[PDB]
């Protein structure tokens, strides 16, 4: 399997989709302003911790295109106010 680190925090990467499948499937994600490395356009959902599912800022993103894949994953930097790319992993 798979997943993200971002900042100190392991994200597991179908805990992630499984959110993702939620927030798609209710048709309730962001409009996002970060788009692919192919130009297509990304909507975000905010990540909650484990399997939680909210809407509520917890200082983490993770981004799909439209037909609702997880893209990448993102860590707000409070300090810089930016939203860090989070590094994705593979396991063996």
Request: proline fraction near 2%; charge should be negative; glycine fraction near 10%.
């Given at each position: 399997s798979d997943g993200w680190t971002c900042a100190?925090?392991?994200?597991?990467?179908?805990?992630?989709?499984?959110?993702?499948?939620?927030?798609?499937?209710?048709?309730?994600?962001?409009?996002?302003?970060?788009?692919?490395?192919?130009?297509?356009?990304?909507?975000?959902?905010?990540?909650?911790?484990?399997?939680?599912?909210?809407?509520?800022?917890?200082?983490?993103?993770?981004?799909?295109?439209?037909?609702?894949?997880?893209?990448?994953?993102?860590?707000?930097?409070?300090?810089?106010?930016?939203?860090?790319?989070?590094?994705?992993?593979?396991?063996?």
């Amino acid at each position: 399997s798979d997943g993200w680190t971002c900042a100190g925090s392991d994200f597991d990467g179908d805990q992630v989709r499984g959110q993702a499948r939620h927030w798609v499937g209710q048709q309730k994600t962001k409009f996002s302003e970060f788009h692919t490395h192919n130009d297509v356009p990304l909507c975000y959902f905010e990540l909650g911790e484990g399997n939680q599912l909210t809407q509520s800022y917890t200082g983490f993103r993770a981004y799909c295109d439209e037909p609702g894949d997880v893209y990448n994953l993102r860590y707000l930097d409070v300090s810089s106010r930016t939203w860090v790319l989070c590094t994705h992993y593979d396991n063996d």
